[PDB]
UniProtKB/TrEMBL annotation:
<dbReference type="InterPro" id="IPR043168">
    <property type="entry name" value="DegV_C"/>
</dbReference>
<dbReference type="InterPro" id="IPR050270">
    <property type="entry name" value="DegV_domain_contain"/>
</dbReference>
<dbReference type="InterPro" id="IPR003797">
    <property type="entry name" value="DegV"/>
</dbReference>
<protein>
    <submittedName>
        <fullName>DegV domain-containing protein</fullName>
    </submittedName>
</protein>
<keyword id="KW-0446">Lipid-binding</keyword>
<dbReference type="GO" id="GO:0016301">
    <property type="term" value="F:kinase activity"/>
</dbReference>
<keyword id="KW-0418">Kinase</keyword>
<dbReference type="GO" id="GO:0008289">
    <property type="term" value="F:lipid binding"/>
</dbReference>
<comment type="function">
    <text>May bind long-chain fatty acids, such as palmitate, and may play a role in lipid transport or fatty acid metabolism.</text>
</comment>
<dbReference type="Pfam" id="PF02645">
    <property type="entry name" value="DegV"/>
</dbReference>
<keyword id="KW-0808">Transferase</keyword>
Amino acid sequence: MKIAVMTDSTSYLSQDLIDKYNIQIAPLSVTFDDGKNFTESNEIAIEEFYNKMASSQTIPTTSQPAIGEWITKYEMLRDQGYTDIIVICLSSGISGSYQSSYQAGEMVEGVNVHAFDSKLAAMIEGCYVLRAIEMVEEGYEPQQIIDDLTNMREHTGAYLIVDDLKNLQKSGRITGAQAWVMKPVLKFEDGKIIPEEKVRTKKRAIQTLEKKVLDIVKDFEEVTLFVINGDHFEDGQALYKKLQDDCPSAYQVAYSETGPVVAAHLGSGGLGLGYVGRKIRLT
Ligand SMILES: CCCCCCCCCCCCCCCC(=O)O
């Protein structure tokens, strides 16, 4: 038994962790109105995508990884001697990436595929990858890892804000809150993005983000917080630094940024604050 752990590009893991653990990536892509296609990777500068998304009369379109791209990654890992693959996926409620990975796992032969619906995105989805890799080192077997991630999913969530709900409404990735389409505060619930609160100012939106998450994680034996920043770099840093001061060092407070696919649906000002009821190994 040789267990591998892979994921899609929306987990937004750093290249250090991808190089160190040899994490294979089934990438997602973005397509602009001028015909330019771009698959997600750590090579493209994220601020270059934000400049292009701002310089586009049409909101760009994203695409999940094709089922043939999961199969190619499955066959490559199988041909390297791997017998079991743990696949961490973008939330099935916002993308068909998980179902594509799930169906590809049924089609590829000679290897066992264990697809997991993380029900979230960004580095919060990547924390499942890091938890799975940690358990593989510990000698666990795929079903034990899947059961551990399922329990981890019950104490994992995210709140987020956006400048305008036009990017999410165009993509249909926002459920409800049609009267809102002030600053909205959204949240992930069962893998979907739903409204949570409508606040008066962007400043009180970020304050609301911290209050909602801090009120939840105080009942957790372990806490890993993740600031997922957008194009406004000062928003994520101010929240990240304020969390470092307001939270005890027993809390693991980390920082990360969105990629092109997530930014295409959030639009400008896409700031998020995620949490996991575990102490994830980030090294
Ligand atoms: C704090 C962490 C939460 C951050 C939330 C980021 C995800 C919001 C928008 C997701 C929609 C993009 C998925 C579409 C992919 C596809 O085209 O299949």
